[PDB]
From Swiss-Prot:
Enzyme class, broadest EC rank: hydrolase
GO cellular component, one term: cytosol
Protein name: Methionine aminopeptidase
Binding-site list for substrate: 76, 96, 175
Physiological role: Removes the N-terminal methionine from nascent proteins. The N-terminal methionine is often cleaved when the second residue in the primary sequence is small and uncharged (Met-Ala-, Cys, Gly, Pro, Ser, Thr, or Val). Requires deformylation of the N(alpha)-formylated initiator methionine before it can be hydrolyzed.
Top-level taxon of the source organism: Bacteria
UniProt xrefs under InterPro entries: Creatinase/aminopeptidase-like, Pept_M24, Pept_M24_MAP, Pept_M24A_MAP1
Lineage: Bacteria, Pseudomonadati, Pseudomonadota, Gammaproteobacteria, Enterobacterales
This protein's UniProt keywords: Aminopeptidase, Hydrolase, Metal-binding, Protease
The keyword Lipid metabolism is assigned to this record: no
Outcome, altering residue 76 to A: Reduces activity 100000-fold for the Co(2+)-complexed enzyme, but only 2.6-fold for the Mn(2+)-complexed enzyme
Cofactor: binding comment: Binds 2 divalent metal cations per subunit. Has a high-affinity and a low affinity metal-binding site. The true nature of the physiological cofactor is under debate. The enzyme is active with cobalt, zinc, manganese or divalent iron ions. Most likely, methionine aminopeptidases function as mononuclear Fe(2+)-metalloproteases under physiological conditions, and the catalytically relevant metal-binding site has been assigned to the histidine-containing high-affinity site.
Subunit and interaction comment: Monomer.
Length: 260
């Protein structure tokens, strides 16, 4: 749908909160911490300090506040008090906060302790795949073009794009239309218009594209057990570009992108 300025104002708030959860949690992502504790830290911050709520907690049956996906876990990794992070791990923490009725959805990769060459590369390339997509967002561009660009970039770096999961519209709803595929598909025919709000969250595997759902029904792993990485931002299409609503202090892309 198309958001009104009033709606967007609220999404800036929700987006900022979600981004601040990732900024706040970064220092905590080190060797020895459990994903369960990280989840608790995020939730306590969201509820007690931001006076907001995790959109993930309870969503479609999800049992935790954030999704934490380590190494080969592609997405929806369930925080676990017994799962400890260690040197070299690449970890995605996907956050979604609701505030004043609107959602802010974002994720980033954290590398624990000493990064491995491939781990740093996969994360960097993945973030750049998101950045290149964000730099294309403007009225008139077709979402299919963005998916094509992401895939082309990722595969040229020897990595694969997960097909199953995609970006999504967002607002009062967590996952609204349209679907934002991260690969070229004729199924995609959406011309961007001002006011549209959605996410871009490419999941990239170091190995093959195939994935598999684990026994908990949420955790997804690469079929070949290769490393996987993902970054995500929620944006609003502006009259001549876009505004990243979940920009962080560490992001290396501007919040307001304009074309012409
Ligand atoms: O439900 C999804 N993600 C969640 N993260 C935390 C709680 S729920 C999700 O990505 N769903 C998509 C796959 C099916 C429909 C869209
Ligand atoms: Co999800
Ligand atoms: Co997300
Ligand atoms: Co999302």
């Amino acid at each position: 749908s198309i958001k009104t300025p009033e709606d967007i104002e609220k999404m800036r708030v929700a987006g900022r909160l979600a981004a601040e959860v990732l900024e706040m949690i970064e220092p905590y992502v080190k060797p020895g911490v459990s994903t369960g504790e990280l989840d608790r830290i995020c939730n306590d911050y969201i509820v007690n300090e931001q006076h907001a709520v995790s959109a993930c907690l309870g969503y479609h049956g999800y049992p935790k506040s954030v999704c934490i996906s380590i190494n080969e876990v592609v997405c929806h990794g369930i925080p676990d008090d017994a799962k400890l992070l260690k040197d070299g791990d690449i970890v995605n923490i996907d956050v979604t906060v609701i505030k004043d009725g609107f959602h802010g959805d974002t994720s980033k990769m954290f590398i624990v302790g000493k990064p491995t060459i491939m781990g740093e590369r996969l994360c960097r390339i993945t973030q750049e795949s998101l950045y290149l997509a964000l730099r294309m967002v403007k009225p008139g561009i077709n979402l299919r073009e963005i998916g094509a660009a992401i895939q082309k970039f990722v595969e040229a770096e020897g990595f694969s794009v997960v097909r199953e999961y995609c970006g999504h519209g967002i607002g009062r709803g967590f996952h609204e239309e349209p679907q934002v595929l991260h690969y070229d598909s004729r199924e995609t025919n959406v011309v961007l218009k001002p006011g549209m709000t959605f996410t871009i969250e490419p999941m990239v595997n170091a190995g093959k594209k195939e994935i598999r759902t684990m026994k908990d029904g949420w955790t997804v792993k690469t079929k070949d057990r290769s490393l996987s990485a993902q970054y995500e931002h929620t944006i609003v299409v502006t009259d001549n570009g876009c505004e990243i609503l979940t920009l962080r202090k560490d992001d290396t892309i501007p919040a307001i992108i304009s074309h012409d």
